[PDB]
Each structure stands twice: as structure tokens, then as C-alpha cells.
Amino acid sequence: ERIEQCFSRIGYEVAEGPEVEDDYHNFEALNIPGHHPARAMHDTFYFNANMLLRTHTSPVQVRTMESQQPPIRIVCPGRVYRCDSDLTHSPMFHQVEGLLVDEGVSFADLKGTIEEFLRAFFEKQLEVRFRPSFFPFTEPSAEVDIQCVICSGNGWLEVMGCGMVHPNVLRMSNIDPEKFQGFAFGMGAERLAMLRYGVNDLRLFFDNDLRFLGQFR
Amino acid sequence: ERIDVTLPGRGQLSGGLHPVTRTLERIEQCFSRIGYEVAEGPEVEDDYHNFEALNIPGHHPARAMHDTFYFNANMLLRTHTSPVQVRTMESQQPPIRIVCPGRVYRCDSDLTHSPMFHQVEGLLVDEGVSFADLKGTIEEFLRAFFEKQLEVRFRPSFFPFTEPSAEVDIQCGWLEVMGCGMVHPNVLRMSNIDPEKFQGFAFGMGAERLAMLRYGVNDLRLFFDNDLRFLGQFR
Amino acid sequence: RYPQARLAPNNKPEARAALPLLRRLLVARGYQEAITFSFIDPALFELFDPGTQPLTLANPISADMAAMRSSLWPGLVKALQHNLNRQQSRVRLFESGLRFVGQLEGLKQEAMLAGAICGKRLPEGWANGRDGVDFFDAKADVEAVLASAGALGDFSFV
Amino acid sequence: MKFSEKWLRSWANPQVSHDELVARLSMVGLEVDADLPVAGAFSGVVVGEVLSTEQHPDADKLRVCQVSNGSETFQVVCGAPNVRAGLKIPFAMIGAELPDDFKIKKAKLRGVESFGMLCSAKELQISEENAGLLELPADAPVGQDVRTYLELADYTIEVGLTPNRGDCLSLAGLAREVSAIYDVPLAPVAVDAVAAQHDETRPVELAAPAACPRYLGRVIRNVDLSRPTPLWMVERLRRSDIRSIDPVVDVTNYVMIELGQPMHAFDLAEINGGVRVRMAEDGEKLVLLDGQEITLRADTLVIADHQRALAIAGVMGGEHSGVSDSTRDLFLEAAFFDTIALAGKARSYGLHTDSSHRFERGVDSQLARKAMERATRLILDIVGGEPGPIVEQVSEAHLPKVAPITLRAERVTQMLGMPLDAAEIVRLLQALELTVVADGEGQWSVGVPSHRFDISLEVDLIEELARLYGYNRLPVRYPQARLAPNNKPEARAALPLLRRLLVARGYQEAITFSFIDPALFELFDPGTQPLTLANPISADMAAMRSSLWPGLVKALQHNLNRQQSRVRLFESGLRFVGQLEGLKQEAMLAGAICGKRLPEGWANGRDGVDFFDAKADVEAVLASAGALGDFSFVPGEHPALHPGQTARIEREGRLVGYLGALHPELAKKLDLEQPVFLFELLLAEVVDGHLPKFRELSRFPEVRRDLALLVDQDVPAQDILTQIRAAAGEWLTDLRLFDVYHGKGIDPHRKSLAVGLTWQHPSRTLNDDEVNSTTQNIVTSLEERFNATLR
Ligand SMILES: CNC(=O)COc1cccc(Nc2cc(Cl)ccn2)c1
Ligand SMILES: CNC(=O)COc1cccc(Nc2cc(Cl)ccn2)c1
């Protein structure tokens, strides 16, 4: 609710989609080729060869890009699924992804958006660091770090990823990369909640113990 | 053996909000979703914030005791929420994007008019603001508010605080629903805002008038009686 | 045209009980929202605020609308008894708005949330007890409001 | 990718400290995962030579040694089993400071004087080898500090590479980056061509030139495979996490880690008439060097001879064709395999090698020759032999070729939010080995080097500039937007509103797994086939939920087992109804309650929660958008619910959901000894409501009449209330059922319904005659419809 509010107050629309998705919306449309390890059964939950459980909320952004022409300003919260299960990782979790597609969007616009979001979210004028990373769906891409001001026990912490939407991603969804530029970002809701509330064990989120839940009234 | 019927549920159920509160919230939401901040101010104001700062000269009939409620020569009950926009313009330099809902007061007595009522005023002050920007804002507001792609008409009017000014009509053969205009240079200048660098638009509307249009309310006096037979209809 | 804006993500702190949140809670707790005149009868003002000189209007609409309210209670009680006189038994009202404390020099205009209840604890129904509302029913409503931003322990009823 | 910093600095030295280098690497896109010292700290330890050993005359486990430091001969008593004349060892002199504050002093061990100590790798924190003294190369410089000789003032840096930086899977790759980052000279290893000593070759055939456009082969005769891998190579491989196995594998691994070129050596005797680089025949079998028997597919590139397949090209060699102890002659291979043709091929056979990784990520297509010469020199140095000429088979048509990219200065300024100077742009791109040529004003034609597989577009060039300029040095702007006022309809009950209402009504929000146990699914949904996962995490998380109830009930009993009595939970989320073809993914709001109606308190009744408490919660949700009257609670049945306490909820005959007590037989099966009340609503059917429509308020009094009605115990109360409204005329304002009596005062199969009827005319007072008339028509209607009687 809090992540959505930071963007919805500035023109972003809340977009939702199905949790049972197809290879196209979940992978192909996001510049993830068929031979990419993300598509394997070691990471992705499958029903058949083409139908799966979405590994991210980006398919929702894809469905938006197909349905309409720019400007697009959307935030996509939702349940996402991954095979990797144990401590530090759950087979089901939540993430919030964002997308802005307009005529003159820059990496400067993205840095500003992300920096002000984290500041608004954590209610502090904290330091925000951008490290060059990689994602098939963005170029340039960045991993975003914040200071340890919200601790590791309640000098940098990785909290989210972002980048400029890849030309092939726009082109595939019938958006001219020559006329339109865009940025997109993603974050894990549980990771953020743990940072905010001083939660140590991620497994506490899915047990629904009243002795846990009651602490958030 | 232990069967039962589906009778009403046990206990207390929900009450509800007042139609004006529903309307105010709705008007705020149309702007707050696009960058506007909700600004509030005092209901007991001074001549300066209520009149002088808004280009209303001392000899103007609006200032008279036939229309304005006074405590002494300089202190009054605000006749509009514009003093809040004035206090904002004094406190900060542009950009300003604000919506000002609130209780306002006027001497004018009975039937079509109450001595206390609510209004929502808006203000946008930036570097390159035009009358085209204002037309778009207002047209899209009314469409969002009334949930219809209705026809919007702008008639040239007059206000001391704006130039050019307009009275805004909607269909249902037309209905006047609000007023707006480009902020007067003297209004900006008085609040230390260079009219050469900054332009602005402002608008105003009555919440009760809007609620009546929306909910089919005939008598404006029903709003301040708080009859449960009235209130209950807005749950 | 639609005005352009360089807008940045922003939000208010999480741990805060705003009035829109509080209104909806009172709605859920079986209250109807009232809006009363900020100016009341000086006689009524004196009943609720003995010894205080009200901030009086120079040109009031009528003499019974001369005094700026120092409480939302005279208005709330009057709306309550307006309903009681109109065949209503269970009246549960709340109002938010300014209070006017002091004379012009030093005047305080503070936003209040006030509530007024009467009649049966529960609405008339086959499954509901026929007990009249009391202090502890109103206390629960105050407790629920006071706990809205996870700070109930910061308050004390003395 | 792990590496020695000393080795990296020998190619490109950034003139900054270790800490500064590790900091910058992550800041330019090479995230450092670890930076560790190669050894423990110590001083006073030099290279020593054992001149002679004698048996200690008073301790059999000890030896009396004469050790030289190149300047002087010292007597040292040693107990290590490997101590012998001629051995080059670390000599810790009197004065030497070893790890964990161990100072070497003078000693008289069993009557014999000792002027130092000879060390094990363990004693020096070099290795965990305490088996004996750290044996040093026969040619070690005696007297030199052991830290200097063994290059122990070093760190190993581990970088977690992104899939686009396959070029950094080598010291050559990483050093080129450093040279760019720091704008410093790059001194790559000078690789002189090794001259052929004979003319023996083997033919090479490129039968699949699109999968392998270049293949280099070389005969190396009379190699002595019994010879050891030199220490400098063992340490360089070890500092890159490569374990030393045998001289030939060590060289090919070393060449790969140094230059980025995976290589392979075959036993020449195991090659029947020349090399054939071809696709596998479908079902062709190959036993790998690790013993795995792979059944190949026609899409897989193999290195074959004229008889059979020898290796799976670019991934792993075969057992038969590989080097063994019996090997006397080698056939070296250095090839370029196309990335696309090799993509996911190792994974499909369940394999992953350093070679498969590098070829899939991309190996410089021009590198094979330099690497071949390098590996030859190393083989001749380590195991001897005689090299023949290099056989290079190449397909010019299939060599990778990336068209020049035009980069526009205005596109860099737009993206970065600031302009970069033409000189800075050129310098930065040239450092990465890109070919930059001016193409007019604020435009360049940029050529991509053969080691880069991630650069094909203008935006990739902009990334390179941003990366090396510094992401955090770039400006910060907020995106522009032509925003217009907008809003959603007023008369709608959104889920955020509903959650808060349930919170206010004393509910705690739960989040449960969307996939449940098929056994649990079958209890709540008998006979329905769940949408089952193909690869579930476990078998008890195989079924996609068709209800939020199994999860809600399970979380409820989780709490009941944790000393909770009053559990009131709600959850929102998707339902999965049907199989893939025709699947329905509907958002639901479901709730589950148990225990006392009210929390324990002095002022609270101690009654247990029932159906009507859950009903009130549903009613409150259903009335959230002013459309309560659009819904109806009809006696229904659900397999998970008690058939006597179940309401089917509808809107215009359409199913909204169900409300009821959890079936006592389901409770038994779950070992739940408390009554539980459940509801589940289809949010798409609850969200829409109606906007208030003002109805005029009467200035006139209302009239109330109370009716006590005797009806059959089973006739539904809402059927009677509905009939009353129908027969009460135009002026009824309120109808209330204030009591139900099923006592002794009446028949045991009947019930008394006490109803309050209120009428108000909008324009006048109502007279008693008309109200009594209206009341009689209600009664008459109830007599003719339900055989009702007045009490
Ligand atoms: C949990 N997520 C993370 O840490 C980082 O997520 C990211 C990073 C960058 C982009 C995106 N999403 C995206 C979606 C479209 Cl449709 C196009 C381009 N990108 C998500
Ligand atoms: C019922 N109320 C109306 O029609 C109100 O109409 C108007 C019309 C135009 C502007 C304004 N407010 C305004 C405020 C400032 Cl600070 C400066 C300039 N103007 C109000």
C-alpha cells in the first residue's frame, strides 16, 4: 500500500494481472530468449510447456504496453513465484514493479524517481547509490543501494533494481524506441518490510502466527 | 438437526459519512492523484489575507457587513478559502499545486444560501502556465467528478483576483457549476511572486452545489439539520 | 493543454492516524457524520463553557448564531436532540472541525474530533440485547481511535 | 570469476590501493563478492637449502640438519619426515616472527643446538599442509624472503560477473577493464610464435562451419607427462579457484584463465585420421572424461575423428581420446564456437564446465592463435616435446561480424542528462578497444572488438560511457508529465476499503500459499481436479487453490495449537478454477472465525461466535458501496460447510459466494474441536454499488405498528419480511424483526416473529384507519402465502 502511494500521488496507475501466465508475457516479451537459464524448471514453476507461474510482475507491464500507446505510468504489486525455496527465499512472495514510457525520458529521470522514492518510503533523507548491473529487459541497468541507517539489526544495502527499458522490449510491444524512451524498476516487498519493521526471519510472513501479526496493528 | 435460517446478522453495522464530506474527498482526489497538495488554514481571518491580498479594494461591496461576518474592523470569518492560497504564496516560491477545501461564511441569509458552507479552491503557479492549461484542467476535472464525458462551456466573467476569468457550465440546457481564471498580476506581486517570471491559474467551486447535483438534493438547508432520515441516505 | 510537471515520488509518514482514516473507523463503529454551524447561541455556549467569554460576531445572522464554538459538543448535542424530537431513539453522531479558544489577540483555532451517542447500545434486532448505551461503549470508540496509529499505550484515561 | 591482484597488476596497474581498486570495481559494474589475503602474516622467513642431515644421537624422530641461507650455514634440528639433503625450504631464523605471535628463539633440543626452524605451509598459514616441510622448487633463490618468492603480499579478488561480461572471464579481460577504468597502459603477455621442429600435422575438417568458424590443431610429440606442474602456475590457478590436476590439463586451464581461451588436449594416438568438427548423429554415444555416458542429439556440435566422436565441442572431452599416463604425443585444440549454436547445450545434458560457460558467454573469435602459441610454449616448458606446425581451418563467411554502430552525441546528452566532451567520449570508447571514427558533427562510427559480444546498438555504447564516467556522477532529474485530473467512480467498494473495514470489525489479515496439498484441496473441493504444478517444490504444494479456505483454516488451527482461542482472519487473493484451457483466476475476499464472540473483558459477554456474527461481517462488506439490497442470502449447500448452517450469497441470481459453519466432518478430519465460521466473496461481484439518490424528508410524524407472527419453524424469515414490504403499500419507511420465539408458549413446529412496521407519508399525517387497513392486508397476505397467525 505504502509503495503504491508514493507513485499513485504523482500520476501512476495501479495495474494488476494474472498469476498464471504464458512464456510470451513472462519471458519472450521481456527479451529473455528460449535458451535463457531463468526459463528452466530449476527456477520457474510450470503447468505445461507454455503456461507457468509468473516469476515477476513485469508481464502486467507487458499487457499494459500491448493494450495502449504512451504515456504509460504504472505500478504493479503482486504475488510472484520461484522454485528456489528454503531460508532467505520463499516459493511465493511479493514484488512491486514500475514503468514510465514517454517521449523524452532519461536515466537522470530514473535516478531522481528512485532516489525520491526510497527517501519517501524510508522516511529519511538517506544516501542512494546506483551500481551498473544487467537485466535482459533494460539497458542501462542498475542495482540500487541505500545506507545501513535502517540497520541489519534495528556500509550499504542493496534494496532494488532498475534500468532504461530495452529498445527490443518496446519494439515487441509495438512502441517505437526512436519516439519513446522509458524506465522500469523492481523491488521485493518482503525485503522492504524486513528493513522497515526489523523482521529477521522471512519465514514469519507466511506462518500467520497471531503473536507475529498482532505486532503490526 | 442443528439447522437455522438466514435471519439478519448480530450486532452493530456501519453508519456513514456526510454528503459534503464525500464530495470534498472526491474533489481532492481528482487533483491529489496528479501532484496537488491539500492546504488548510484558519476560519477566522484578517482583511489582508481575505480581501486586500486578493485585489479586493476597501470600497468593494464584498467587504461590507451586508455580506461579510466581522469580529472587529480587521478580523472576520473567511468568505472563501483563497486566504489559504495567499498564505501558501507568501510562505513559498513557485511551483505551487494546491487544493483548499474548507468551511466558508457569508451573511446572505435564507433558502438557496446558508450562512456557513463549504468550498474547494485550487491554485497552480509555475513558469509557463496558460489559459489553455486552465481550460484542460477544469474540463478534465468536471468529467472525472461527474463520471461522464460531458460538454464543458467557458463563459467570460469577472473576479478581482483573476484576469482573464470564466464561469464554467456543464450540460443538463446548461448549468453553472464553478468559476476560474488566470491569477491577477497584482495578486502575485503582493505575495512576492514576479508576474514576469510566473503565471498561474486558480479555480473555485461550492461543495454543497456539487453534492446537490450529484445526489439529487433539492434543499440546501438539509445539509446542516443532521436529520438521520437525510444522513442515512448516503451510507 | 494540460500543464506539465516535474513530479517526484512522495508520501507522508506511515505511523500517523489522519482524519479521513478516523472518520471511516467511526463509520465502521456505527457513527453517522454530522456537520454543525461553527457559530452557536451564547446561552448554549455558556452551558458547555461556564465563565468563558465567547469570540462574539459584530454582525451575526441572528442572535442565536453569535458565538464562535469552543467545543463541537453544543452543536452535536443540539443535532442529537433534533433527531430525538423526530422519533429517533438511537443517535450516534461524530463531527470534525475547528474550535475557537480565546479572544482575537491570542485566538486558537484547533481541529477537533468529537462524538455524541444515545439510546440502545445495539440497533433493534432479533439477535441483539436491549441494553442502553453507557460510558464504556463510548470508551471503546475512543480507544479504537486512540489505537489507530499503534500508539494506544501513549494515552491514559484519568 | 576469482583472480590474483598481483597477476592483474602485472598487466594493468591502477596506482591506487587494494581498497580503492575493490571499491571502484563494484562501482563500474564488476561487483566484488570477496577480497582475501592469499596467506597469513609473518617475517624473517627466507629460502633455505638443506646441505646435509644426520640422525639426532638422542631422539629417533629428529634429524640434525646443516641449512644455508646463501650467506651462512646454520644447524637446525628437524622432526619433519620429508627433511633431506638438497631440499629448498622456508627457513625461519632466530628472530623470525611466525603467525599467532610465534617468535623463533635459540634452542637446545635433546642436547643439540638449533639456530632456526624449517617450516610447513601450515606453520606459515600458506596451506593446511602440515604433513611436512613446504618443499620449494629445486631452483628457488636461496636467501630471498619467502613472502617475496611466493608472492604472498597479494589478495584474491572474486567478481560476480553479469552474463553480458563474458570477456572478463580471464585475466586478459579484467586487465583491459582496469586499463579503461583508470586510463592506464595495458601490457598483455608477449606471445611469441613457437617455431615447428617437424612437419607432422593432422587434417582438420569444419563439417559445421556456422557452429565452429575457426579451429586450430597442433601436434606435440614425445611429451613426458610424469613431470610436475611448476609452482608459479599452481599458485596462479589456485588464486583463481582452479585445482591443479595434471600438467597438460593445468596448462589448458591456465591458458583459459589467463587469456580467456578454453583449450583441450587429446592423446594423438587416439585420433583416427584427422579431426572432423561436426554435428552428432541422433543417439550417438560418448563417455566423458568424468565417466558420464551421454546420448547425443543432432543439434550438438562434437569434435570427432573419422571413426567416432571424441568430445562434446566446447564443453567436455571424452574418456578414450583424452590424455592418460600412457600418452606420449598430444594434439592440441583451440577453437571458436558460435555462442548461439552452443547456448543451453551443456545444461541439456546436465553439464557445466569452465569451457561451456566461456563459449556460451562468448570467447574472442580472434584469440585461438595467440592461445595456441602460449599453450605450446608452456607444454614444451613443463613436459618437453617437439611441436609441429599449426593447422588452422577457418570459414571466413561464418566468422562473427558486428556492423559499425553510429553514436550521436545528442543521444548521449539526452540519456545521461548532461553532455560529455567529444575527447572524453572517444577516449573512453577507445580504452574499451572500440574503433571510433568521426562521422561529422556530434556523430561517430564505432566498431566493436572481437572480445565483446554485448555491443550491437547505440544504447550499449551509452551504457559503456555512463559506466566508466560513473553512475553516481550523473545528474538527477524528475520526469515531466502532462497530467490531467482523474478519478475512479464514487460508488465502488475497493479491496483497500474492505480490508480496513474487516480490521475495524476485529480481523487480522493473513497471507497463505496459493498452492496447497492436493489431499487438503480434495477435502474442501471433492471431485474437482485441481490445476496441478508439473515441478512443485514439494508434493504438499502441488495444487492451485480453488478456495482461500484450506489456507485460512490451516492458519487458524496453526494458532489454535499455539494457545490462541479467538482467531479471526481474513485473506484476499486469486482462486484458480478449471484446467489451463478455460482457467479462471478470480480475486476473492475470504474470512474465518472461531472462539468467543468478543475478546475477554469485564464488560463483555462470554458467548461463543456463531453464524450470525460472521453474517454481520459479510453484511458490512456487502453494504460498503451502498448496494446491500442487491444481495440475498439463500439457504444453500457447500461440501466444506455444515448443510444446516450454509447461506449461498447471490446478486441478480449470479453467485457472489458462500457463508457458513465449517462442516463438522471436515473439522473431525483436521482435528479441530471448535466451531469455525467461513465466508468467501467474489470481489468482482462486490465492488460495484450505487450512488445516493435523494428521497425527500417528510415534515410529518411516522406511525409504527408491531406484529407478532406465528409461522412454520422452517419458513425463512426473509420470505416473510419480503411479503410484508410487498403488502405494506407506498408509505413503509422501515421494517424490523426485533425478536424470534421458538418456545413453549406456542406449537413446537412453529415460531413467533415479532416485527416492527414504520410508515411515513411525505405530505401529511397518516390516520389510524388507513394504517389498520394496510396492517390487515399484510396479515391476509401472510395467511394466504404461509398460513400465518397473529399471536
Ligand atoms: C525484484 N526486482 C528487482 O530487484 C529489479 O526489477 C527490475 C529491474 C529493472 C526493470 C524491471 N522491470 C521491467 C519491466 C518491463 Cl515491462 C520492462 C523493463 N523492465 C524490474
Ligand atoms: C463558488 N466559488 C467560486 O466560484 C470561486 O471562484 C474562483 C474563481 C477564480 C479564482 C478563485 N480563487 C483564487 C484564489 C487566489 Cl489565491 C487567486 C486567484 N483566484 C476562485
XYZ file of C-alpha atoms and ligand atoms in Angstrom, chain B residues 54 82 85-86 89 119 121-123 159 161-162 167 178-181 183-184 187 202-206, ligand 2:
45
model
C -6.818 39.147 -3.487
C -8.497 31.846 -1.133
C -3.739 30.063 -1.124
C -2.462 33.546 -0.119
C 2.105 32.047 -1.847
C -15.947 25.283 -0.996
C -10.397 26.285 -4.337
C -7.365 25.432 -6.430
C -4.087 27.105 -7.388
C -13.285 38.338 -10.408
C -8.253 38.228 -8.161
C -8.181 36.743 -11.715
C -17.781 30.903 -15.309
C -17.762 26.694 -10.914
C -15.533 29.718 -11.595
C -11.840 30.066 -12.521
C -9.288 32.421 -14.096
C -4.192 34.721 -11.254
C -4.146 38.562 -11.404
C -2.212 39.154 -6.567
C -6.963 29.372 -9.854
C -10.474 27.939 -9.580
C -13.293 27.743 -7.054
C -16.469 25.724 -6.521
C -19.194 25.226 -3.897
C -18.150 29.213 -5.587
N -16.771 29.664 -5.652
C -16.212 30.115 -6.771
O -16.813 30.187 -7.850
C -14.765 30.547 -6.667
O -14.265 31.007 -7.905
C -12.970 31.448 -8.026
C -12.697 31.778 -9.344
C -11.400 32.082 -9.715
C -10.384 32.081 -8.780
C -10.661 31.773 -7.455
N -9.620 31.780 -6.496
C -8.417 32.471 -6.485
C -7.565 32.341 -5.388
C -6.386 33.056 -5.437
Cl -5.274 32.946 -4.110
C -6.073 33.851 -6.511
C -6.972 33.916 -7.545
N -8.132 33.247 -7.552
C -11.964 31.464 -7.072
